[PDB]
Symmetry: D2
Subunit: 288 residues, 4 copies
Amino acid sequence: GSRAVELEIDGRSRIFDIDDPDLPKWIDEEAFRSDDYPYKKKLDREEYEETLTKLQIELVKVQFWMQATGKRVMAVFEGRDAAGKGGAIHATTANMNPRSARVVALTKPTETERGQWYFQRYVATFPTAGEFVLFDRSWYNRAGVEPVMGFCTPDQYEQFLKEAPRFEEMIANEGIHLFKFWINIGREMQLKRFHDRRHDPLKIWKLSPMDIAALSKWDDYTGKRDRMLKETHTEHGPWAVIRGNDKRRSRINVIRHMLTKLDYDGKDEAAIGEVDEKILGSGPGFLR
Amino acid sequence: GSRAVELEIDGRSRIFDIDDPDLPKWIDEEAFRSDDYPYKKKLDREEYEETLTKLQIELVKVQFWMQATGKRVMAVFEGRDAAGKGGAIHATTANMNPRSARVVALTKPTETERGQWYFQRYVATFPTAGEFVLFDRSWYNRAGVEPVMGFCTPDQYEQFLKEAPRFEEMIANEGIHLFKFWINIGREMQLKRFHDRRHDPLKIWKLSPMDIAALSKWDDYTGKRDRMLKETHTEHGPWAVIRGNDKRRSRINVIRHMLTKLDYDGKDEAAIGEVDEKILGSGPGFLR
Amino acid sequence: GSRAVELEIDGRSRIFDIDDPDLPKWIDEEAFRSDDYPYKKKLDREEYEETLTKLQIELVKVQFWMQATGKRVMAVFEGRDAAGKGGAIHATTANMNPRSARVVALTKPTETERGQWYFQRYVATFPTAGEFVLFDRSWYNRAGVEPVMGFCTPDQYEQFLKEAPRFEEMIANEGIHLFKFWINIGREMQLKRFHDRRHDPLKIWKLSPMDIAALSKWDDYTGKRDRMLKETHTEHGPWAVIRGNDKRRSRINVIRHMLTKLDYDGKDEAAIGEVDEKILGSGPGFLR
Amino acid sequence: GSRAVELEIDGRSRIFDIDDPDLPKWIDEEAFRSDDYPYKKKLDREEYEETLTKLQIELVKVQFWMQATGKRVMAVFEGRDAAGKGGAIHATTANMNPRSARVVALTKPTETERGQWYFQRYVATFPTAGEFVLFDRSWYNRAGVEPVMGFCTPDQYEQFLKEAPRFEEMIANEGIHLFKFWINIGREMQLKRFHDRRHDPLKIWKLSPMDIAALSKWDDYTGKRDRMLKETHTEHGPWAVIRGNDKRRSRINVIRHMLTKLDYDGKDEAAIGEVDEKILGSGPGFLR
Ligand SMILES: Nc1ncnc2c1ncn2[C@@H]1O[C@H](COP(=O)(O)OP(=O)(O)O)[C@@H](O)[C@H]1O
Ligand SMILES: Nc1ncnc2c1ncn2[C@@H]1O[C@H](COP(=O)(O)OP(=O)(O)O)[C@@H](O)[C@H]1O
Ligand SMILES: Nc1ncnc2c1ncn2[C@@H]1O[C@H](COP(=O)(O)OP(=O)(O)O)[C@@H](O)[C@H]1O
Ligand SMILES: Nc1ncnc2c1ncn2[C@@H]1O[C@H](COP(=O)(O)O)[C@@H](O)[C@H]1O
């Protein structure tokens, strides 16, 4: 295998060939149970849909209340590569008005942007009255992919970790409600999903040069993740941390978290349910 | 009862009360067959999803070919209110990369924009290399909703009809491939969809005072549609015109049309299928 | 007089008619010496031109140093209406490259802009590598003209005073050198300059309804000045405060200040000269 | 002595060393009379200022009329390097309100801009109601500096020549008044000004590597000028062509031309005077 990589999965030497259509047993058997996942089987499709429908009905109410009051929301999505960021975003926006809820998904910075204040091109996307803005990756590029891949210098990395709390304090002081979600998955789950994307012609667009590099960089991402959650989890900018091995439970609890934190007119606490504390936690210390 | 309207439906007076949860039989019985619709029943869902999957797999190939060549695509979506243009956009973008495929859904112009060249704020959204940009409504606001609702003057309307072909001639000469889709529905189908949206807590966001006002302005929108298709169907900017009573057949044939017109790498004509000529036609005079 | 205003000049009732082409003696004879001005006559024109020329030669060096190193500079100009903000900006940019030094002169916020984070439209103007950005009025609109005329609420005013220091902390931590200049003049000098502009067909455009109304708001503007200087003079964003009764001395010492604070290659200490401490001071308490 | 270039001056080899402080007599003696210049001596300095003052008083009237009517103006400035475009722009804007009259001086395109429609980044600077926008260079980069220096391909060059008339047809049809000014100078005048800029510490910022390369490329620019004037001078976008050897006469007739073409309230034709038809002509053929 040309793209096959060697990996150290706790003392054990493993080879992963993403192009091999056959998934080996040590990934197949451990993918769902990795990352101390609390559930034995994934949430059934029809129970997920019944619950998600009820949650999206509540988000329609949220949007109506935001147009009426002018309230603005920003929701940041980050995590392990292949953890399910885009799916949590689509589950949130599926039944929202595209003229008042929009997704930010920026590309690599231009020469002009690289010479700007790092946050400038993100401020350009900030919401006006009533808008719900969701970030498919965010300024937290500089706390993960950029230092791991050397797209920013160590000093730029250290600088970003000191400025992000200041940036988000202004956001919160302005009255924009800022959500930050870190969607985690276990190591073998990431391998399984890279394999799934590689061998599905409908999903192979999800598999980028970055992800193939992320394979040998698991521990470095772990370090950057831990460092980032500990140093940028502040009162003004709290991190909600998700065990995301089950995409369905991930999406449901992301949305439950936002509904509970918003004091929107018409809110039906029965339809929201409870955030599963086994799936969604706060700040550092949630992931072992 | 507070918003019931009296309508003239092909010679007879009819009452439509959108807030009445019961749909009148004269709407429910005629909605699907309205607008000379060529089929007796809905396309089967399972068949539709199987076909949509093959089309989205081709759209992955399209996006790969656009990235490698730099080719750019713009897809304009217009039509009768409630004809499902957002549904056609989601079916196109569901498995495309949000960093290279994006949706434009502008809100009403600010005072600054109203004093600008009408087209300026649309040029601001134009694609860079490899981008696929989809317009959920477009500069064709000024050929429909604006003149019907008096948001632009008649001089401004007549000016737009003359200037849009010149605008699209420059788009086409730049080598951006411009698709324009008009999705039609029959009058009874519009009422049924308005009613369904009003009484579904998940879809009530899809209604707006613009829609509410469109109830009493059917014949006005008809003439604005005819005038616009006549005056702005050109070689450089041709209109693809859709009988959209069946949302599944609408979405499939929209995507098939684009796949047929794009000469992309890896194109599988057997997977694409044939554009259904009973559903998708060209220019003025296809619809009655 | 159609728009004559009655004023109280230290317990004495005075009447100022700006449309009267005759300036009264009490304005003409006290204009230059108001605000405890330290010099008895205005600076000799030839000496001013010789000095400004040397100073603009140093600014040429500054611009070359900024292109090579990438250093970015922002210069904010606020003051009494008619104090000479544009003249200080023109003296600074007269021999600078328009592609790397630019002036920001925003108009009143659009509806979209009013629903945004107040600072958003100002971040959009921030410099990329090498750029010198000057603000002909700035975000400090909300600490002066906006509360005085009621274009913002008391709550928005108090919020700005808390947030402007945090905003400029981020600017300073980014390594953009931010200058802030308050150009003060005496009351009678303001009256004289309004009069001069009213009766000069070349300068009448400088007279706006905001200035006509400022005629009666002298004391209100005084309090806003004092409050804003004390609460937004910080280590990260220091205020330079200028006695501006003499436009020539105002322009020279503004530029001297910036030349002294920038550590640019080729700095000719002898060319810069001494900042006149009788003209330019730091922070509150300089004016009285 | 480093970057001396050999030039062919109508049958003779000449050496020009821009770094030599002494200017050769063959340049000095021919500079003002070059380009079939029709006057023996430059315009009297005090007479120029008196005329310019009266023209700028007329431009105040223009601005007030544009504010009241919403009328918009765009003024494009191109010409030989060192012809004085920036000087003509400052003479127009010196006594205009910088909140409604603004200068566009774009830098080289980003990667993103290079993948866009060439005109898109210029459309982003178009005027809203009442604005007067001046271009210090324009989209005509692609008919001059870009093809001469190889920053665009021949296909892109030919495409621009065909598309610029279509672009300006839409500008004119929109009711924006578009002026295009080509400021020409003689070859020895250009060498003289280059030499003057190089050896004046106040103006050396006016030189660029682009200017240095222009030295050896005079004949290329001559053809590029003539092609552009022939192919893009149209009814909707006419070129005003200036003999600019005397910068005072260039500035005055540029402004006179605009005042003549604008039907503004309070127009005083005696103040405007007559455009000097020996200095300012129309389209190709005016220049040798
Ligand atoms: N050369 C680069 N410099 C800075 N950021 C980059 C660079 N290349 C990729 N990125 C960013 O890293 C993140 C991951 O990139 P990629 O995997 O290629 O696409 P996606 O995130 O959509 O899956 C993106 O936000 C991307 O813009
Ligand atoms: N006052 C207005 N002036 C101009 N355009 C308007 C105005 N109000 C609404 N519109 C436009 O009419 C179109 C239909 O409005 P709406 O139904 O709310 O959007 P949507 O397509 O998402 O349902 C939108 O493009 C909207 O911007
Ligand atoms: N209605 C308003 N709301 C907010 N700001 C305003 C409003 N009107 C004027 N301003 C601002 O007050 C400042 C003074 O403007 P003005 O005196 O009218 O003209 P200028 O600043 O060009 O001399 C400007 O920055 C202006 O944008
Ligand atoms: N590498 C480049 N590519 C395209 N345009 C450029 C490039 N370099 C300079 N220019 C443009 O050429 C013109 C001359 O530059 P300057 O003399 O520096 O004003 C300006 O419009 C520049 O933006």
